[PDB]
Amino acid sequence: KVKRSRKAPPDGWELIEPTLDELDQKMREAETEPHEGKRKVESLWPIFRIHHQKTRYIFDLFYKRKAISRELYEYCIKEGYADKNLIAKWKKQGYENLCCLRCIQTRDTNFGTNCICRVPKSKLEVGRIIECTHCGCRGCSG
Amino acid sequence: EARMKQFKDMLLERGVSAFSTWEKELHKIVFDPRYLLPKERKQVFDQYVKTRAEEERREKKNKIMQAKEDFKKMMEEAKFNPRATFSEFAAKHAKDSRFKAIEKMKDREALFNEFVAAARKKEKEDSKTRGEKIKSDFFELLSNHHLDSQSRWSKVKDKVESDPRYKAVDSSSMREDLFKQYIEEKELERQARIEASLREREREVQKA
Numbered sequence: 270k271v272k273r274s275r276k277a278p279p280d281g282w283e284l285i286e287p288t289l290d291e292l293d294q295k296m297r298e299a300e301t302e303p304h305e306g307k308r309k310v311e312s313l314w315p316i317f318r319i320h321h322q323k324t325r326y327i328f329d330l331f332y333k334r335k336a337i338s339r340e341l342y343e344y345c346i347k348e349g350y351a352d353k354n355l356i357a358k359w360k361k362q363g364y365e366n367l368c369c370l371r372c373i374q375t376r377d378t379n380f381g382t383n384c385i386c387r388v389p390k391s392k393l394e395v396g397r398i399i400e401c402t403h404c405g406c407r408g409c410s411g
Numbered sequence: 412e413a414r415m416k417q418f419k420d421m422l423l424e425r426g427v428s429a430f431s432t433w434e435k436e437l438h439k440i441v442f443d444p445r446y447l448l449p450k451e452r453k454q455v456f457d458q459y460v461k462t463r464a465e466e467e468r469r470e471k472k473n474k475i476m477q478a479k480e481d482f483k484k485m486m487e488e489a490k491f492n493p494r495a496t497f498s499e500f501a502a503k504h505a506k507d508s509r510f511k512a513i514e515k516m517k518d519r520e521a522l523f524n525e526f527v528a529a530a531r532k533k534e535k536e537d538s539k540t541r542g543e544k545i546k547s548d549f550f551e552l553l554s555n556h557h558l559d560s561q562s563r564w565s566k567v568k569d570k571v572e573s574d575p576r577y578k579a580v581d582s583s584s585m586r587e588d589l590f591k592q593y594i595e596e597k598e599l600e601r602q603a604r605i606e607a608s609l610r611e612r613e614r615e616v617q618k619a
Contacts, residue, residue: 284467288430322435329432334460336429 273348279341285330289350292323310402317369317404320352327351328359368409372401386410417445418455429463477512481519482526484509493531497523545579549586552576553593564590 270293278286299315327345330336337345345351358364358373371377372384386401389410393399399408421443422428427436433456440446486492488504497520504510513519552574553567564587571577580586 283471284464285430325432325435329434330430334429336460336464 270348270350279338279344281337281341282344285326285337288326289323292319292326292350295319296323311405314405318406321355321368321404323350324352324355328356363411366409366411368401368406369404371403372406372409377403384409414448414451415455417448418452419459421445422456422459429460429467478518478522480509481513482522485519485523486526486530493527545576546589548576549580549589550593553590558590558594560594562594 296316296319299319302312302315304312327337327342327350331342342351346353346356352370354370355367358367358370364373367373368386372386375381375383378384384401384403386399386404386406386408387410388408390408393408399406401409421440425436425440425443427440484504484507485500488507489495489500492500500523510519552571555574556562556567556570558567567590577586580589
């Protein structure tokens with residue numbers, strides 16, 4: 270992301286910058302991935318995951334490692350590296366391993382429910398294939 | 412102790428550091444036999460994280476010092492290289508390890524340009540400040556004698572020449588001009604500027 274907010278990043282940026290650059294490269298590579306050989310929705314699967322992974326990286330640096338400052342965290346939020354809504358959902362209980370925001374958007378589904386991946390494996394069928402259509406995860410529940 | 416050493420080796424060998432998630436490298440480090448050799452892993456990871464947070468700031472400081480050293484090598488390997496181009500400063504300073512440590516040569520050119528501009532501005536400001544100090548010293552030395560419009564520069568030359576303050580002025584014509592200017596504390600100056608504004612407004616409106 271060469272295009273930034275016309276300033277200098279806060280202190281501690283260079284510590285995490287190479288990992289963000291690698292994630293940005295992965296995201297760009299996923300964008301340009303040809304959609305032949307896959308289904309219609311599977312081509313959108315990597316972006317979600319990368320985004321989730323990307324949003325993990327900042328979320329594991331401000332709460333579970335405390336490795337970045339508050340201003341750096343907000344700079345990462347404002348630059349599109351971190352997802353404010355996804356992080357806000359993760360702070361809740363039972364939403365720690367939430368894959369994407371779409372899997373809990375109630376009225377996106379036909380019946381005002383969640384995605385199938387939201388169903389916990391405890392009350393799931395033993396050995397069923399769990400392949401989400403929105404993002405393709407094996408069950409993002411607890 | 413061997414378990415902690417193995418944990419550190421696993422954290423440093425698999426392309427991991429304090430800037431890579433444990434829950435993201437867990438799929439690449441769990442298969443290591445050293446991983447098997449709760450809280451001990453967490454404590455070791457936290458200690459390594461703190462030590463590496465200090466060490467990364469130290470390494471950034473080292474890189475900044477390397478940039479400063481590259482600038483110093485490009486600037487102080489010759490007669491200050493004021494107007495020396497990139498080729499001139501490169502052909503004379505391409506051997507030492509200070510420049511060879513810099514992996515990028517474009518960084519060297521950008522640092523040389525920025526530091527040269529900053530040093531030119533600083534040198535101009537320092538020269539101007541020294542000139543101001545010399546002018547103040549010369550004015551103070553000239554004021555030591557009861558001089559007015561009737562006083563001549565010939566007597567100033569005969570009674571103020573030996574003063575080191577007058578020696579700061581390297582030109583006799585400049586000294587004579589300064590003497591002529593001098594021959595022809597702040598809040599009251601503020602009121603003087605207010606009066607200046609009043610008189611300029613008065614002349615403008617009076618002409619109109």
